[PDB]
């Protein structure tokens, strides 16, 4: 009765995907929400990110199992800003898994026409 | 913790531990002396109090 | 009026306004009724 | 990067994902088992059933039957959009497809109604229930004895494991990685000794033992992940992966182009 | 007295379209809905909701005011 | 009595 | 009742595979024999045919016909 609707898990209900606010705590500090994302997105992101040299900090939090969303605070070097270093980390990713699927396709192709 | 478990949900989703609740409700016709005073019927508002 | 079935035959009895619940070709005295003609939606999950 | 596949079967890939990171490697795991779109009956209207399986016993079996949903991301009328997205007032050929049920028992014995008793409104090959059994009959559905009867109505939908396992193309996921323990990502529990005492894997022959004096190397990272996709038969395993790579890349590019 | 209380409807737009149910209540704006699945129960906008005739057929609100009105 | 038992439960049609 | 479609962890499909399971049983081959036949590796795919009670065979026997 008090189950919430599965549709919840992939329907924004007017909520933004992204948000992107500066950590004033912190300099060059930025704290991005994405909603109805979770660990899939997050630990690809945030591994990449610390693959960045210009990238001081970069962590993410699931706040609840309950809410679909995740936190994700990056900071970086003076002379960056966290938004530019997640573009690129993001962009890289896609190169990445593009290599992966047309190496995947390429493979796939190959073994088939072994087994033909 | 605390004598709690963790349920996976799509083993809930697949029929897991999943049960039909069923009850019954009786009712029958009531009569004193020779005058019967129920019926089953589709009651009206405009005649029942 | 209102169709009920044999509880042991399931045959289709036209019961009317007080008479005897009791089956014509089955004697039983229990039947039941028909599914509503109302639609039934059920999503499967 | 690079990929070896070391095995193909009819509902499964064996392969090996190299030169990438864990992460990565988990996010495919993920994503190929909680996101990738199939097509499974999700309404069910019934007008006779006069079986022993109550409604939504009935209703909840059909949902699991899995229905063929290969090219599902293809523009209509080649795939399927989702009918919360779609302009149909409940649903259409665009964002639906129509199955029907009807069985009746006059027989003496036991009627069983199998996937293949199932009628598919015909505007493509999608939503065809997958009859994979060498009988191809496909999943057993129900059981009626004389003058039980089932007449129903489906409506299969679009959607992914995340709103109802049912949407699922994975059965589960084989992974693995490091089989010698060189980088020492877990304490093997034992009580005597714990080479002897943990079964070595069949990934273990892929990967070079570890060498008796070699220093804990402790700024390798596990770059060799050997993963194995089982497929439910509603989508290819190839397609499988392809499609989930597709769908890692599109939250990413989501991502850039909302910040940008 | 609202007219549309007791009535067959279905889900017109909305995460939750496709699904039947029967106007339990009813306010000005939106219509609280009991959905034959799931024992579940909703409110959903009036305007969101085809309505169930005699005959089969599905009508929109608009449709359904004007039906009710009487005026011919 | 088993025998009559059977008797009374097929012929409960005819006897009623 | 009667076997479910998939197996409840991994999701498989067993409901095509019941039939072929007591037919396998039939020709004098073990429950673990007839199992490995049937391609059912994982021991979770496994216990739901090993442990499926067929309970919709005994509810079809109470049918108000002959
Ligand atoms: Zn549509």
Redesign the pocket.
Same mark, same amino acid.
């Given at each position: 009765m008090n189950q919430p609707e599965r549709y919840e898990l992939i329907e924004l209900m007017g909520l933004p995907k992204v948000t992107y606010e500066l950590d004033s705590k912190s300099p060059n500090a930025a704290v991005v929400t994405l909603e109805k994302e979770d660990h899939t997105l997050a630990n690809m992101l945030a591994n990449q990110l610390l693959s960045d040299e210009r990238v001081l900090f970069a962590g993410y939090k699931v706040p609840h199992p309950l809410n679909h969303n995740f936190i994700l605070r990056v900071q970086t070097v003076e002379d960056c800003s966290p938004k530019q270093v997640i573009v690129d980390a993001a962009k890289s990713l896609i190169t990445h898994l593009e290599e992966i699927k047309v190496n995947f396709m390429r493979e796939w192709e190959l073994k088939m026409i072994s087994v033909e | 913790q605390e004598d709690s478990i963790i349920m996976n949900q799509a083993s809930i989703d697949r029929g897991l531990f999943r049960s039909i609740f069923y009850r019954t409700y009786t009712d029958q016709e009531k009569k004193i002396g020779m005058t019967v005073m129920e019926e089953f019927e589709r009651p009206v508002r405009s005649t029942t109090l | 009026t209102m169709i009920y079935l044999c509880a042991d035959c399931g045959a289709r009895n036209t019961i009317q306004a007080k008479e005897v619940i009791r089956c014509r070709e089955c004697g039983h005295r229990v039947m039941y009724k028909m599914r509503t003609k109302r639609m039934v939606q059920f999503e499967a999950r | 990067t690079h990929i070896t596949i070391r095995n193909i079967s009819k509902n499964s890939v064996d392969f090996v994902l190299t030169n990438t990171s864990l992460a990565v490697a988990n996010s495919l795991r993920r994503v190929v088992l909680a996101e990738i779109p199939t097509v499974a009956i999700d309404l069910v209207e019934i007008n006779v059933n006069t079986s022993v399986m109550p409604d939504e016993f009935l209703a909840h079996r059909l949902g699991m039957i899995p229905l063929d949903s290969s090219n599902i991301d293809e523009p209509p009328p080649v795939g399927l959009?989702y009918?919360r997205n =779609?302009? =149909?007032d409940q649903? =259409?050929?665009?964002?639906?497809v129509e199955l029907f049920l009807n069985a009746k028992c006059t027989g003496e014995g036991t009627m069983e109604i199998y996937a293949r008793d199932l009628v598919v409104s015909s505007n493509s090959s999608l939503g065809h229930p997958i009859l994979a059994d060498p009988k191809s009959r496909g999943p057993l559905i129900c059981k009626l004895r004389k003058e039980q009867e089932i007449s129903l109505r489906c409506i299969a939908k679009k959607g992914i494991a995340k709103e109802h396992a049912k949407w699922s193309p994975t059965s589960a996921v084989a992974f693995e990685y490091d089989p010698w323990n060189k980088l020492q990502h877990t304490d093997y529990w034992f009580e005597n000794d714990a080479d002897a005492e943990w079964p070595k894997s069949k990934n273990a022959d892929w990967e070079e033992p570890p060498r008796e004096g070699e220093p804990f190397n402790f700024q390798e990272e596990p770059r060799r992940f050997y993963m194995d996709v089982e497929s439910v038969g509603s989508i290819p395993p190839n397609e499988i992966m392809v499609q989930g790579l597709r769908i890692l890349q599109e939250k990413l590019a989501v991502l850039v182009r909302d910040l940008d | 007295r609202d007219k549309a209380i007791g009535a067959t409807v279905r889900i017109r737009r909305g995460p939750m379209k496709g699904l039947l149910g029967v106007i339990k209540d009813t306010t000005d704006a939106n219509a609280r809905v009991e959905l034959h699945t799931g024992n579940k129960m909703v409110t959903i906008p009036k305007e969101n909701l085809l309505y169930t005739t005699k005959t089969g057929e599905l009508i929109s609100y608009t449709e359904f005011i004007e039906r009710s009105r009487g005026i011919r | 009595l088993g025998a009559t038992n059977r008797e009374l439960i097929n012929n409960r049609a005819a006897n009623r | 009742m009667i076997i479910p479609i998939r197996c409840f962890s991994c999701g498989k499909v067993i409901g095509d595979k019941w039939d072929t399971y007591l037919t396998l049983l039939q020709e004098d081959n073990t429950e673990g024999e007839a199992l490995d036949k049937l391609g059912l590796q994982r021991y979770c795919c496994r216990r739901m045919i090993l442990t499926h009670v067929d309970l919709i065979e005994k509810l079809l026997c109470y049918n108000p016909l002959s």
């Open positions: - | - | - | 959009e009918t =779609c302009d =149909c649903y =259409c050929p665009k964002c639906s | - | - | -």
